[PDB]
Amino acid sequence: QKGAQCIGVHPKYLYATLDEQTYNEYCTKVQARQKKAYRYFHNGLINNT
Amino acid sequence: ENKVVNGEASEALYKKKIIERRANIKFDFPPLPDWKKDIQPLNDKLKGM
Amino acid sequence: FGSRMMVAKEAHTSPEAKQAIVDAPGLDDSEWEKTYKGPAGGVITVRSEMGEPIHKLATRGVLFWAEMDQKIFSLPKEKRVAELKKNRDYIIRKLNADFQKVWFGKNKKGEVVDLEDMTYGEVVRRMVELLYVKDEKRWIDHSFAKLTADFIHRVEERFTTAASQPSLIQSYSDLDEPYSAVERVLAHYPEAETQLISAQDVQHFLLLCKRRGQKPVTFVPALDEDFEFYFKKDSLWQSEDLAAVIDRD
Amino acid sequence: NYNGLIKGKPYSGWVDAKTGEPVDDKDVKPKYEKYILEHSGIRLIEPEL
Amino acid sequence: AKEILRSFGNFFWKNDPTIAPLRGALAVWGLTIDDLDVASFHGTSTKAN
Numbered sequence: 001q002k003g004a005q006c007i008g009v010h011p012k013y014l015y016a017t018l019d020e021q022t023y024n025e026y027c028t029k030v031q032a033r034q035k036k037a038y039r040y041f042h043n044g045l046i047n048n049t
Numbered sequence: 050e051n052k053v054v055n056g057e058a059s060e061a062l063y064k065k066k067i068i069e070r071r072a073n074i075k076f077d078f079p080p081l082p083d084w085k086k087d088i089q090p091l092n093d094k095l096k097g098m
Numbered sequence: 099f100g101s102r103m104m105v106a107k108e109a110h111t112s113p114e115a116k117q118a119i120v121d122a123p124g125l126d127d128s129e130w131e132k133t134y135k136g137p138a139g140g141v142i143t144v145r146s147e148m149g150e151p152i153h154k155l156a157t158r159g160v161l162f163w164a165e166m167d168q169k170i171f172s173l174p175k176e177k178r179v180a181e182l183k184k185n186r187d188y189i190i191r192k193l194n195a196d197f198q199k200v201w202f203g204k205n206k207k208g209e210v211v212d213l214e215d216m217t218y219g220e221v222v223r224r225m226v227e228l229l230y231v232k233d234e235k236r237w238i239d240h241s242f243a244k245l246t247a248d249f250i251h252r253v254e255e256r257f258t259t260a261a262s263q264p265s266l267i268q269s270y271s272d273l274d275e276p277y278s279a280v281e282r283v284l285a286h287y288p289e290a291e292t293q294l295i296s297a298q299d300v301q302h303f304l305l306l307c308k309r310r311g312q313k314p315v316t317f318v319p320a321l322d323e324d325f326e327f328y329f330k331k332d333s334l335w336q337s338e339d340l341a342a343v344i345d346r347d
Numbered sequence: 348n349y350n351g352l353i354k355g356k357p358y359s360g361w362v363d364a365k366t367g368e369p370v371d372d373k374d375v376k377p378k379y380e381k382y383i384l385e386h387s388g389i390r391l392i393e394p395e396l
Numbered sequence: 397a398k399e400i401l402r403s404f405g406n407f408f409w410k411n412d413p414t415i416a417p418l419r420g421a422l423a424v425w426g427l428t429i430d431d432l433d434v435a436s437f438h439g440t441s442t443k444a445n
Contacts, residue, residue, distance in 0.1 A: 007418065007432075012082045013425040016091035017098060020084055027081050035294060038076045039214060042296045046348045066265040071255035072372045075293070094426055098405045301350045301359035308357070 112340040122155055137161065145171065147330040158196035163329075165192075171326055182321040193318055198336045198343050199329065200228065202317045213300055213319060218253050218290035221303070222283075225249065226276045228317050231341050238342045241312035243273050248306050250283060252299060257287040316342070 015023055043049075052060065082088055104111045105119050122140030125132070132138035137156035144160060145167045146152040154160045169185070170178055182189065190201045190210055203211045205220055216224070229242035237243045247270045254265055266283055273279050284290055295303070307315050308324070314331045340346050350359040353367060361370045370378075386393075409420025422428060438445065 007421055009422075009425050009427065011079065012087050013091065013095065013427070015082060016088050016095040019096065020088075023084065023088065030078060030081070034076060034078050039294055041076055042074075042298075043214070046297050046350075062269075066268055068251075068254040068258040068263045068265050069371060069373050070258050070261065071252075073256060073259075073289075073293075091426070098401075298348060298350075298360060305357050305359050 110338045112338055114340055115337045118155055159198050162192050162196045182325055186321055200317050200344050202319045214297055216295055218295055219284045222280050226280055230276050234341055239313040247273055253287055253290050257289050
């Protein structure tokens, strides 16, 4: 008799709570991190690690 | 006839090279919404809330 | 007579290299052995690619070569890669400042990076930059045009998605204006400007670079087991073709 | 992936996991998609698993 | 400043008998029950469920 429920909302609604500068700084970080991630991912994949 | 007169070797110039589609995996983090088109119309109501 | 003839008018030694020979004081009969211990009379002995002693002018590059012979190439092969990694920043700085073979890895900002930290567009541009004499409008060697072409095709493969598409590069002499052709092709695959090279392509690129018959590359691509090959191989022609040397130094 | 000598020749790229013959991306889907579809998803119980 | 944001921004409807939690949660973002577009169902292919 365990009912469970959850509600998700689109990320734009969170970004709409920041100022433009804070948003753009976050953009910067996620972009830099993305490059690093893509790189690491290939390396681990090719080497089964 | 066009083969014979030119001889065989020439034909490499017209038997065109074609690109094999090597794969392209990407760590596609979610696309950052445009500040102006997406964020700003919601920002006036949601900023600081 | 051999060494005395390098300053002859009809010898293909570059004018600046001839000047450097004239600027070298030389040594007397009782002093030539000093070259084995360090620079003497403007000359120093180093270990060639064949393992034998070789007298060279004590240029900044040859002094760095002597340093590498003492610090890296004296070590057993299994320890070389670890010591190279430990001295990476020092070695790259010296390659770029003092040696005829510069470090390959360089991003759009001009920062020193590893090959895997480079985008496809950066790789292609850096190839043209180091393999083509811009002022003389020539490739250093014909095989370098071919090498640049082969890697360009790899870009086509990595970024084309429509099936059965013809290569833009149906022929190789196309790259005899390499700066315009490269821009014209990077303009078609704009993602090459942003995506980093995937490491299989890195390895592939290295295999292309180590292909036979083709001239060895004019730069150091990686600090790995083949560093002695990248460093020492085919290292004398640069004294005759100074236009092909970075900064004509 | 493989990266080194095959049959004394250098090769780097994909190879078949059993034979070690080189394989191109374009050929993966035609060569194996049928097996992938037969051995993934909802299917008859495979006792080896 | 944070307790004010928690009181009015995030949790204003918690412990209120005149706001339904699903409503309140959407209202944080300026959304209403009309803005719930998708529902992923437990969907067990059983007749009763």
